[PDB]
Design an enzyme around this catalytic site. Structure first.
Site, PDB file in Angstrom:
ATOM      1  N   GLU A  11       0.809  -1.230   0.000  1.00 54.02           N
ATOM      2  CA  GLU A  11       0.000   0.000   0.000  1.00 54.02           C
ATOM      3  C   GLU A  11       0.852   1.296   0.000  1.00 54.02           C
ATOM      4  O   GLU A  11       0.834   2.097   0.939  1.00 54.02           O
ATOM      5  CB  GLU A  11      -1.054  -0.035   1.136  1.00 54.02           C
ATOM      6  N   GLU A  55      -5.238  -8.702  -0.921  1.00 51.44           N
ATOM      7  CA  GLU A  55      -6.002  -8.765   0.318  1.00 51.44           C
ATOM      8  C   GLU A  55      -7.483  -8.537   0.064  1.00 51.44           C
ATOM      9  O   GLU A  55      -7.872  -7.791  -0.836  1.00 51.44           O
ATOM     10  CB  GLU A  55      -5.579  -7.682   1.281  1.00 51.44           C
TER      11      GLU A  55
END
Length: 367
Positions: free
Chosen positions: A162, A293
């Protein structure tokens, strides 16, 4: 021996398309799982967790390593990397876990640093200081790559998780760097530290050196959202070969597979989020695409198994729940994460567009 490869749209192992079904651990102890003799405490739990994956017909675990510098890599007082960790335990700790995982026919994705949060100055300066980055490369990473690259259990390295978390959004003529749409989409939540240019340069240099050391190694980056890894829908793919290579000038500093993460907000997906759409929709078929995810409990109640099944049936190259230790926001239960993987226990379908082999027979280490 055979390793997981990436070719066109697909992962291959041993000649056959494979889909990565499984979970994120993503840690037992956050940033202290490996190094400084900490694996003696942490290892038994995550071996168990890898057992829980083979048991459920899953084939992959994503697990975090340096994180926020808590244990790794080791920095001197001037902010240069001296080594892997002060006790010089990391490579064996990883070596152990990889050997165990192999025995259970599970692949590991090792994620190097966190970008969601990155509250450590010494790491922060790796984004800006060309000499300090090379210390990381030379004194930690190259040696990590060289010791672990004969380990078939090691599916891929992930440079940064991220990156949009600590991204500093802003304009720029070159659209690889323009991120003027992202601030209001919520990027920068970890504090606005790095411009896309430094992010991409940093990941370019790092990939380059992994590939330098292990030519067949697979590298990824896991974006927080679809928004930044497709050119479709008016969004921008910030991590395509051209962009990385043009940031840091290292020509083999590429990712081998894309990776989006995905979570609903107030029970509603983003418009063109992965479980709303096709992988093909992202027009990104040069490389495999992994749903890196996701979680039942931040979805649209489709139910874990239909989620696993949706990803397998609509062109994606894997799907990974968040997360096995069951902690934090938008995390599933380790239990129905196991339920979820069962949804794909049998599968091997080589048909174009369907997902491929799940249960993989991972060969050993040869010497």
């Amino acid at each position: 021996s055979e390793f997981l490869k990436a070719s066109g749209s697909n992962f291959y192992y041993g000649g056959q398309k494979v889909f990565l079904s499984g979970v994120n651990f993503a840690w037992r102890s956050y940033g202290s799982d490996f190094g400084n003799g900490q694996y003696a405490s942490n290892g038994p739990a995550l071996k168990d967790w890898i057992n829980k994956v083979k048991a459920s017909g899953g084939n992959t675990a994503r697990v975090w390593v340096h994180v926020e510098g808590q244990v790794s890599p080791a920095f001197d007082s001037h902010g240069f990397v001296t080594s892997t960790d002060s006790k010089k335990t990391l490579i064996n700790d990883l070596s152990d876990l990889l050997d165990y995982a192999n025995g259970q026919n599970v692949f590991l994705i090792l994620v190097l640093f966190n970008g969601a949060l990155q509250n450590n100055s010494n790491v922060q300066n790796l984004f800006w200081d060309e000499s300090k980055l090379n210390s990381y490369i030379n004194n930690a990473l190259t040696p990590m790559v060289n010791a672990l690259k004969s380990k078939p259990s090691l599916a891929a390295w992930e440079v940064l998780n991220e990156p949009e978390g600590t991204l500093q959004p802003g304009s720029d003529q070159n659209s690889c760097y323009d991120t003027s749409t992202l601030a209001a989409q919520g990027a920068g939540w970890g504090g606005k530290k790095f411009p896309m240019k430094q992010i991409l340069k940093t990941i370019n240099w790092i990939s380059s050196a992994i590939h330098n050391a292990d030519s067949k190694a697979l590298v990824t980056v896991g974006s927080w959202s679809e928004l930044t890894q497709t050119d479709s829908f008016g969004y921008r793919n910030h991590y395509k070969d051209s962009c990385l290579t043009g940031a840091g000038g290292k020509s083999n500093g590429i990712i081998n597979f894309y990776q989006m993460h995905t979570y609903s907000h107030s029970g509603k997906w983003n418009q063109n989020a992965p479980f709303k759409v096709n992988r093909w929709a992202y027009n990104v078929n040069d490389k495999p695409l992994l749903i890196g995810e996701f979680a039942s409990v931040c979805s649209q109640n489709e139910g874990i198994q239909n989620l696993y099944k949706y990803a397998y049936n609509n062109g994606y190259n894997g799907a990974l729940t968040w997360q096995f230790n069951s902690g934090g926001d938008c995390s599933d239960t380790y239990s129905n994460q196991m339920y979820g993987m069962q949804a794909l226990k049998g599968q091997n379908d080589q048909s174009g567009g369907k997902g491929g082999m799940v249960s993989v027979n991972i060969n050993h280490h040869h010497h």
